[PDB]
């Protein structure tokens, strides 16, 4: 067996792939072998399911390349990377109207993604709640967390830290966590409420303000003081620029912490998250670990330790080059694309929209389902498959709870998916509808949900 | 007439233009846009303030530069490790790596072809996952027995901070056997004294962070067998092989520390350490399906079915996994053996050479059978050469070297040690230069006695 | 022995480091080996001792890479490089107010640096002087040169060309060459006076005008006609832009030649110098050598012969992209940083400043010493060592002459050392002072002068 | 006026090329403007006149690019570059059989090229001679130097340092410095003899051994002790590999110093020279200057000061990757090309060869003239012009002395000019001959000498 690339004895990667390789191989052959199979990966340019950055900027590539060995945890050897990281924490804190620091540095940290940021926020919430119950001489025996249609990271948090997850069910007419149902789920064991400022499954915002009012009335009627952690994975880098009037952040007294993804609308490369706390009081010191460095010690509250500092550096690059002025324009461009697709798609079939890409309602996304008791001659699963044959990945999936029988299609508009590409999508969308119309036997065959978690 | 306080002033000599002071507005989110290339050069220029770690002998993390690794990482910047759907080849390469590492550690042959394990950001996450699984297995055993599960504890030696975090975050009592003069590590006797029915497991550190020595699981495994025999209490182990996991399999195959031992239910290691991968790569392997409680695994829907994942992080880059595979492919056992041996030769050389320069007692001398490629020593008790290791460390910094001097924990807290790490890139020629600067530092301290005792700050020791 | 990079038998560069290597080695291995140890060199970004360019410009790297084989002396094969070189000579001549050329080309040449430029200037001075003395049948074996705190290249000139060096001593209150002491050293054997327009050790300018007037009076009283050569290594590319009114160049009749460094404030990469002569009469033709080429013979006055033309090309790039407009802003930026540091440092200790970075007084540098009889609890040597531990190289050294007891600290502000970096230096400066204060035993230990020559 | 490249108002480099630009210009525009006119430079691949390296090696480009700012004189900031430089000096010393250092370091230095190397060697020669005459109570007012057909750098040395240059004339039947004529020119005022181990104009070696014998006899008959400096600009990196048995170096007692060009057959990029002294006694300490550094103090004997360290590094790269083994094969390849050309060219016309590319006679060069009283119907100048029309630069010029009536053609074979290219040259050579034969009126028209100095 020979290889046509190297014109030599074949070196299989699929063979003996269950055992650690025995011999050495020429460096450049190993590289070309791996490089060639990586072509099997998609480039995600036509993938409209993910929230994660997929566009390419030469400067970001250069910054990441230079940072490949810069250790985020090693403040001693990489002091400048550490300083840039502190700047970012302050800037994000400022973006979310966090109270002015006493010493001068905001309370918060960079993370690998929103998952870790949420875990940290969740543990802090659990610890503050525990300190309160013990002081009240009550049992910390069975904590619970109230939320709406949260992302899987919260299910993991609940599971891994033994907290009862009280998720308000998604239901026809009310897909999100409303004040009434939220209150019905709250009690003395509730460690906190987690509104999702940009629901993963639909793109809509769960507004913290009305929930905050309900929590104020709750403490007035029962004495039970409940706080909030905002999961703003996507919305945290949207609303501050295109809808400053929405009061969802630290302007609300009960919001003790907020988390968001830099690698989503924060525009940073994969591997960047953020979590900020209102003030020192919001973060139990018992969770912070202090390590020694030549220049004094620094407290850290993170799950990960050693990791590259490139994403933080790239995130800073975006903050510096764009500013509020730049982010507003970038974000608005995505909202224009989403709004356009919503309006245009509505003219093509009997659809009921859950999200239409409006800045005041949520993120740059379009989410719809077929109108009840209406049969256009295909399901959204069938349409999704036709679109894949044209290179597009437009996820079709079912919602949860009382709406377990509802099938929706979600389109995400992130940086890089410009108006020109949306127009092409519409062309292929129309072509797919005509094909389904000309080949009725297709209806009902496709029935597998697409990846919806990110 | 333009008051200095009402202006975004300052001319810049690089751009032949003005302003843009990262430190001035550093507390607020920037207001305006800036030319991309100017923002890039501004950031690129201050990154020069970071060290390159070539002369840093404190860290275990990879610091050498390989062109092919730079290319693989550059092409993987947007490849999402969690998105199996869009990046199927990256996911396949990742599964190969898990099987290869499992094979490396003698994990039993999979009943369905795929080993039980996962890639991680680093050893910290790997350890958390291993720790959670240990806690869950212990809990189930106890619940199946109708016993209380509210007082779990974990027995270990001089562990890395990630275990202190695990204990704190998951409410597990950490029973760390104290480091002490004459016994700095977890021995069978003290280990057993700390074990009971609430012990979720024992965590030997196969390559102690602070000294470089291996804690040998075999003797501890025998003690646990005797323990079960005398009490009926069945205790398992998780090996924290952050560094050793990619050393002993190549240069000391005969040390029995892995899955060859029945009680070892899981093992974790750092790819970005001696695994030779770029920062951001860890590994955790479980003996088999039984070793990993399914309640911890989450199954997500994909167009091709569903894949279960047990991880704390979600979205993140797949470049390090790919780079790690590149190392596995180009080196193999044959290549890793030569690479690791080269580091041991340097370490052994430094130990032997440094021993001739002062009254030192060595804790680690870079021997393959004893631990990792590191040198760890302290001044002999009651010996005053005319300086402390802190003073020596500072003199070496003036020569560009970062050789950490710090104190040991427990009841050995009065011990000041110096640790030298020998990782890929720190070749024999550089070790010779270190020796030259070491001797020059000693002569300077000898000629300037007033220096003794002044320096007294510990260096970063955690990695 | 094995190498952990190549995973093969070790190849040491120290073992047989005194004998020519016996065998071949794979090219790439040789490259990586050398590349890896070059990491032991500093990048000079935190080095505030040198005057030489240390910033990086992508365009300059490209021009230099393209010119690696372009031979400066081979006018025949590289006609365009030779043309660009001629343009630069004329532009520098124009910058220094040299009289308009008769034929059209200014009299001058590019050099490797100011050293060579000064040798050429020195030889021409010696020759012009000799031609005068020889006509009067007087001895020409005991020539002397009058100057102030000159750079080492003049000591080399004096030594290599057997010229008595009459250096006016540096002294408290009079660290530079003044008119009075200058005249006291002049006689019929003086080949010329060399004012240093930007003293290496302090940064101050020695003003040619007052010296020029003294020389006019000298000729009036004795008949002895003495000329000048301005060593403007640094000042030559500063004053013409930020202080045009200072009369130090060819506007002065006696100034027969001027030299300066392109690789200093000229902004060119290492390896570029310039020397210009007032006119043909100022340059003895006996020193010029004519070499034949296909297009005709070209004369040259240079110590070096074959060498690369990249630096000249890079220098032209700076001239073209900046112009007077651009150079003024670039140099002003450096002066602002220097002025800022001087003002800020003065608030931290009992210091006496010799140079405070004022455009009318000298170059962008800060030079100071501890006030006489003041004991802050440390020497500038101690402070310098503390700053090294923070990555900075701020030279502390002693002055010459009578000010031999004086120890100064000199900070150079060149392109790349922006305001933000100066702020960081101030932070580390303060940190160093606090450490010295908390550790008194450190005082007096350090006593080695740093490199001060460039 | 518009520019077709930038599609905007034209920017001319010609317009006011004699004045320093007044305004700024876009950097990328300035770069492209300069990049575009550099295309007017030749690449020298078909230039067979120069000895300087013109081939391109990717690793050398990388090493030079990395070293653009590394200052050769700043031992403090660039310790590793300084170390590599010391290794090179020792390796070159070893190559020339210099006595083993009484300490651990050979006596010598790197230079910009052979010119500076020769000046340093010449100065040392003059100083040693002066010291001796003084110790004999004799005058030192009329120093002279005996040599053969030397390169222009020695004419410069003689002129700049006031030494009478006694150059033995090139003559038909005696083009080089022979023992007899050398002795006729020697006296008590001779500072030394300079044999040229690879004559620039022809390529032949002047053998130091026979000359050395004559000088031994001279001291025996007169007591006058005369030393030598070998100008081995080209031969210094040829004979040690391809003809080790030729005794021309430090194996000869009288050879006190040797110089050679790294950027010639040393294979280094432009800007690299070397000069080695036999031992400390051979280098008068009065010429060495000691400068202080934090690491202590190092001595240097150099005309230049600040300059790039890249060539030294690239030179080290060649030493490391090739070794004696590699240089022998590289140099041999050039000799094979030269020998082939000589043998083939001899069959095309009535020629008399002065150099035929034989390793035992000289460097890889071919030098010939038309046989006396032979008229093939063209001059070598005519042939040279025809070859230029085919892209080749094969210099035709006259020899000096009474050989001023001798027109020769010299072909240099350096790295890169492989056998395949030589065959192409022969094709064009024959084509040129046929053209000249078919167009007789061309004979005698061309009469300008080509650049012959390097
Ligand atoms: C609301 C929400 N939270 C958390 C996550 C997980 O973010 P990450 O993948 O960056 O950890 C996602 C994708 C999300 O949409
Ligand atoms: C034994 C040990 N465990 C865990 C860690 C943490 O690994 P990481 O920094 O890769 O999370 C280290 C550094 C270590 O030495
Ligand atoms: C006043 C002065 N003259 C000459 C020099 C030497 O210049 P170069 O290093 O460019 O030869 C320097 C450094 C200097 O400061
Ligand atoms: C014999 C000889 N000496 C000196 C030189 C000048 O060398 P460089 O150009 O390197 O100064 C040459 C070209 C030469 O051929």
Query: What string of H, E and C letters represents the secondary structure of A270-308?
Result: CCCEEEEECCHHHCCHHHCEEECCCCCCEEECCCCCCCE
Cite the DSSP H helix spans in A69-178: 79-95, 114-135, 152-160
Closest CA to D413 of D353, D358, D338, D352: D338
Query: What is the C-alpha separation between B216 and B228, in angstroms, rounded?
Result: 19
C97 Cα to the center of ligand 3, angstroms: 22
Is residue A17 within 8 A of residue B94, CB to CB? The reply is no
- Tokens standing for residue A327: 């982010």
Q: Residue B313 CA: which ligand is closest?
A: 1
- Tokens standing for residue A277: 């706390």
Query: What is the C-alpha separation between A355 and A368, in angstroms, rounded?
Result: 7
Is residue B204 within 8 A of residue B185, CB to CB? The reply is no
Written in H, E and C, the secondary structure of chain B is CCCCCCCCCCEECCCCEECCCCCCCCCCCCCCCCCHHHHHHHHHHHHHHCCCCCCECCCCCCCCCCHHHHHHHHHHCCCECCCCCCCHHHHHHHHHHHHHHHHHCCCCCCCCCCCEEEEECCHHHHHHHHHHHHHHHHHHHHHHCCCCCCCCEEEECCCCHHHHHHHHHCCCEEEECCCECCECCCCHHHHHHHCCCCEEEEECEECCCCCCEECCHHHHHHHHHHHHHHHCCCCCEEEECCCHHHCHHHHCCCCCCCCCCCCEEEEEEECCCCCCCCCCCEEEEECCHHHCCHHHCEEEEECCEEEEECCCCCCCECHHHHHHHHHHHHHHHHHHHHHHHHHHHHHHHHHHHHCCCCCEEEEEECCCCCECCEEEEEECCCCCCCCCHHHHHHHHHCCCCECCEEECCHHHCCCEEEEEECCCCCCHHHHHHHHHHHHHHHHHHHHCHHHCCCCCCCCCCCC
Is residue D257 within 8 A of residue D96, CB to CB? The reply is no
Written in H, E and C, the secondary structure of A122-147 is HHHHHHHHHHHHHHCCCCCCCCEEEE
Q: Provide the β-strand partners of residue B17.
A: B12
Contacts of C393 in chain D (CB under 8 A): 76-77
CA angle C185/C190/C192 to nearest 5° reads 100
Cite the DSSP H helix spans in C68-113: 79-95
Name the 3-class secondary structure at D186.
coil
What are the residues whose beta carbons fall under 8 Å from the beta carbon of B445, sequence distance 6 or more?
A: B386, B387, B391, B392, B395, B451, B452
What are the residues whose beta carbons fall under 8 Å from the beta carbon of A174, sequence distance 6 or more?
A: A181
**Burial (CB count within 10 angstroms: exposed 0-12, middle 13-18, buried 19+), residue D360:** exposed
Query: What is the C-alpha separation between D40 and D58, in angstroms, rounded?
Result: 23
Give the other-Cβ count within 10 Å of A94's Cβ: 17
Name the 3-class secondary structure at C329.
helix
C231 lines ligand 3 (CB under 6 A): yes
Q: Which residue has the tokens 């998720």?
A: A167
Q: Provide the β-strand partners of residue B155.
A: B175, B202
- Tokens standing for residue D217: 């006899």
Is residue D237 within 8 A of residue D267, CB to CB? The reply is yes
Closest residue to D289, CB basis, from C34, C155, C289: C155
A179-185's contacts with Cβ under 8 Å and 24+ in sequence apart are A179/A210, A179/A211, A179/A213, A179/A214, A180/A214, A182/A146, A182/A211, A182/A214, A183/A214, A183/A215, A183/A218, A185/A144, A185/A146
Name the 3-class secondary structure at A380.
helix
> Would you call D321 and C24 a contact, using CB atoms and an 8 Å cutoff?
yes
What are the residues whose beta carbons fall under 8 Å from the beta carbon of A50, sequence distance 6 or more?
A: A44, A412, A414, A454, B80, B83, B86
Query: What is the C-alpha separation between C80 and D34, in angstroms, rounded?
Result: 10
Residues in chain D: 454
D198 Cα to the center of ligand 4, angstroms: 10
Is residue D89 within 8 A of residue D106, CB to CB? The reply is yes
C-alpha to C-alpha distances, D97 to A114, C304, D90, D253, nearest whole angstrom: 69, 27, 10, 11
CA A155 from chain centre, in angstroms, equals: 14
What residues are in contact with ligand 2 under a 6 Å CB criterion?
A 305-306; B 60, 122-124, 160, 162, 205, 207, 209, 240, 242-243, 270, 282, 463
Query: What is the C-alpha separation between A256 and A99, in angstroms, rounded?
Result: 11
Name which of C1, C2, C321, C334 to mutate to probe chain B: the one with the most chain B Cβ atoms within 10 A of its Cβ: C2
Contacts of D113 in chain C (CB under 8 A): 304-307
Q: What share of chain A is helix, strand, coil (3-state, %, to 5)?
A: 40, 15, 45
Query: What is the C-alpha separation between B438 and B403, in angstroms, rounded?
Result: 10
Is residue A170 within 8 A of residue A204, CB to CB? The reply is no
Name the 3-class secondary structure at D37.
helix
What are the residues whose beta carbons fall under 8 Å from the beta carbon of A102, sequence distance 6 or more?
A: A279, A280
What angle, rounded to 10 degrees, do the helices at C114-135 and C152-160 form? 40
Closest CA to C33 of C14, C50, C52: C14
DSSP conformation class of C100: P
Beta strands in D337-406 (DSSP E): 351-356, 365-370, 396-398
Query: What is the C-alpha separation between A205 and B442, in angstroms, rounded?
Result: 65
Query: What is the C-alpha separation between D372 and C143, in angstroms, rounded?
Result: 53
Closest CA to D111 of D213, D267, D7, D263: D263
Is residue D92 within 8 A of residue D130, CB to CB? The reply is no
**Burial (CB count within 10 angstroms: exposed 0-12, middle 13-18, buried 19+), residue A66:** middle
C-alpha to C-alpha distances, B89 to A48, B95, B114, B119, nearest whole angstrom: 20, 10, 16, 15
Torsion angles phi and psi, residue D372, rounded to 5: -55, 135
Closest residue to C270, CB basis, from D23, D296, D307: D307
C-alpha to C-alpha distances, A391 to A47, A144, A225, A378, nearest whole angstrom: 8, 44, 51, 19
What angle, rounded to 10 degrees, do the helices at D27-37 and C79-95 form? 130
Closest residue to B427, CB basis, from C5, C329, C391: C5
Name which of B65, B427, B452 to mutate to probe chain C: the one with the most chain C Cβ atoms within 10 A of its Cβ: B427
Contacts of C40 in chain B (CB under 8 A): 54-55, 400, 433
Name the 3-class secondary structure at D231.
strand
C101 Cα to the center of ligand 3, angstroms: 28
Query: What is the C-alpha separation between C303 and B253, in angstroms, rounded?
Result: 66
Query: What is the C-alpha separation between D398 and D60, in angstroms, rounded?
Result: 36
Query: What is the C-alpha separation between A284 and A126, in angstroms, rounded?
Result: 10
What is the end-to-end Cα distance of chain B in Å, rounded? 54
D257 is in an annotated binding site: no
Cα atoms in the Cβ-side hemisphere of radius 13 Å centred on A184: 9
Q: Which residue has the tokens 């090179």?
A: D88
Atom of ligand 3 nearest to the CA of C113: 10
A117 Cα to the center of ligand 1, angstroms: 9
Q: Provide the β-strand partners of residue C167.
A: C147
For D9, the enclosing helix (H) or strand (E) is strand D8-9
C28-63 in b/e form (b: 16+ CB < 10 A) is ebbbbbbbbbbbbbbebbbbbbbbbbbbbbebbbbb
Closest CA to B349 of A18, A181, C2, A300: C2
Beta strands in A195-277 (DSSP E): 228-231, 255-261, 273-277
C-alpha to C-alpha distances, B212 to B79, B249, B250, B406, B414, nearest whole angstrom: 35, 16, 17, 14, 19
Which residue's CA is the closest to the ligand 3 atom numbered 13?
Answer: C454
What are the residues whose beta carbons fall under 8 Å from the beta carbon of A432, sequence distance 6 or more?
A: A383, A386, A387, A390
Closest residue to A115, CB basis, from B77, B303, B312: B312
Give the max Cα distance, chain C. 80
* Resolution in units of Å: 2.3
Is residue B52 within 8 A of residue C39, CB to CB? The reply is yes
C-alpha to C-alpha distances, A137 to A131, A281, C217, D327, nearest whole angstrom: 10, 21, 100, 87
Closest Cα in chain A, distance from residue B167 (Å): 11
Which partners does chain A have (≥3 C-beta pairs < 8 Å)? Answer: B
Query: What is the C-alpha separation between B406 and B419, in angstroms, rounded?
Result: 8
Contacts of B58 in chain A (CB under 8 A): 76-77
For A333, the enclosing helix (H) or strand (E) is helix A310-345
- Tokens standing for residue A427: 């062309």
> Would you call B11 and C329 a contact, using CB atoms and an 8 Å cutoff?
yes
Cα atoms in the Cβ-side hemisphere of radius 13 Å centred on C53: 31
Closest Cα in chain C, distance from residue D17 (Å): 6
Is residue D385 within 8 A of residue D436, CB to CB? The reply is no
Q: Provide the β-strand partners of residue B307.
A: B300
Cα atoms in the Cβ-side hemisphere of radius 13 Å centred on B414: 6
Contacts of C390 in chain B (CB under 8 A): none
Name which of B9, B10, B11 to mutate to probe chain C: the one with the most chain C Cβ atoms within 10 A of its Cβ: B11
What are the residues whose beta carbons fall under 8 Å from the beta carbon of C293, sequence distance 6 or more?
A: C75, C76, D450, D451
Query: What is the C-alpha separation between A361 and A202, in angstroms, rounded?
Result: 11
Query: What is the C-alpha separation between A332 and A419, in angstroms, rounded?
Result: 12
Site to probe by mutation for ligand 3, drawn from C110, C114, C202 as the one with most ligand atoms within 8 Å of Cβ, is C114
What are the residues whose beta carbons fall under 8 Å from the beta carbon of A7, sequence distance 6 or more?
A: none
Q: Provide the β-strand partners of residue D257.
A: D229, D277
C-alpha to C-alpha distances, B143 to A158, B140, B292, nearest whole angstrom: 20, 5, 17
Is residue B240 within 8 A of residue B195, CB to CB? The reply is no
A364 lines ligand 1 (CB under 6 A): no
A310 Cα to the center of ligand 4, angstroms: 50
Name the 3-class secondary structure at D67.
helix
Closest CA to D366 of D316, D424, D426, D320: D426
D259 Cα to the center of ligand 4, angstroms: 10
Method: X-ray
State whether the Cα torsion C125-C127-C132-C133 is positive or negative.
positive
Closest CA to A272 of A243, A305, A233, A300: A233
Closest CA to A275 of A298, A302, A251, A299: A302
Domains with residue ranges and CATH for chain B: 1-62 (4.10.280.50), 63-356 (3.40.640.10), 357-463 (3.90.1150.160)
């Amino acid at each position: 067996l020979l290889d046509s690339r190297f014109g030599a004895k074949s070196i299989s990667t699929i063979a003996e792939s269950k055992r650690f390789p025995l011999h050495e191989m020429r460096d450049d052959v190993a590289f070309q072998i791996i490089n060639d199979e990586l072509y099997l990966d998609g480039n995600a340019r036509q993938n409209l399911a993910t929230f994660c950055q997929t566009w390419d900027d030469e400067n970001v590539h250069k910054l990441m390349d230079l940072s490949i060995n810069k250790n985020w945890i090693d403040k001693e050897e990489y002091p400048q990377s550490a300083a840039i990281d502190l700047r970012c924490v302050n800037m994000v804190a400022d973006l979310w109207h966090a109270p002015a620091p006493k010493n001068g540095q905001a309370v918060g940290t960079n993370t690998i993604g929103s998952s870790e940021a949420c875990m940290l926020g969740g543990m802090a919430m659990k610890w503050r709640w525990r300190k309160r119950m013990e002081a009240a001489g009550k049992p910390t025996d069975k904590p619970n967390l109230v939320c709406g249609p949260v992302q899987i990271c919260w299910h993991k948090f609940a599971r891994y830290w033994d907290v009862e997850l009280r998720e308000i069910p998604m239901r026809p007419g009310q897909l999100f966590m409303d004040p009434k149902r939220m209150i019905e789920a709250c009690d003395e064991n509730t460690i906190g409420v987690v509104p999702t400022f940009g629901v993963t499954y639909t793109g809509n915002y769960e507004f913290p303000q009305p929930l905050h009012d309900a929590l104020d009335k709750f403490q007035a009627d029962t004495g039970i003081d409940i706080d909030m952690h905002i999961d703003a994975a996507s919305g945290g880098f949207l609303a501050p620029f295109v809808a400053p009037d929405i009061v969802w952040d630290f302007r609300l007294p009960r919001v003790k912490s907020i988390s968001a993804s830099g690698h989503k609308f924060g525009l940073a490369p994969l591997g960047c998250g953020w979590v900020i706390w209102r003030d020192e009081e919001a973060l139990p010191q018992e969770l912070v670990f202090n390590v020694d460095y030549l220049g004094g010690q620094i407290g850290t509250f993170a799950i990960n330790f050693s990791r590259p500092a490139g994403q933080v550096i790239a995130q800073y690059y975006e903050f510096l080059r764009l500013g509020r002025e730049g982010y507003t324009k970038v974000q608005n461009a995505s909202y224009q694309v989403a709004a356009y697709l919503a309006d245009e798609i509505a003219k093509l079939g009997p659809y009921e929209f859950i999200c239409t890409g409006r800045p005041d309602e949520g993120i740059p996304a379009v989410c719809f389902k077929l109108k009840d008791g209406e049969d256009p001659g295909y399901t959204l699963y069938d349409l999704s498959e036709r679109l894949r044959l044209r290179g597009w990945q437009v996820p079709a999936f079912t919602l949860g709870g009382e709406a377990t029988d509802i099938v929706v299609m979600r389109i995400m508009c992130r940086r890089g998916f410009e108006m020109d590409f949306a127009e092409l999508l519409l062309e292929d969308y129309k072509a797919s509808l005509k094909y389904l119309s000309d080949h009725p036997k297709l209806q009902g065959i496709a029935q597998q949900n697409s990846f919806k978690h990110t």
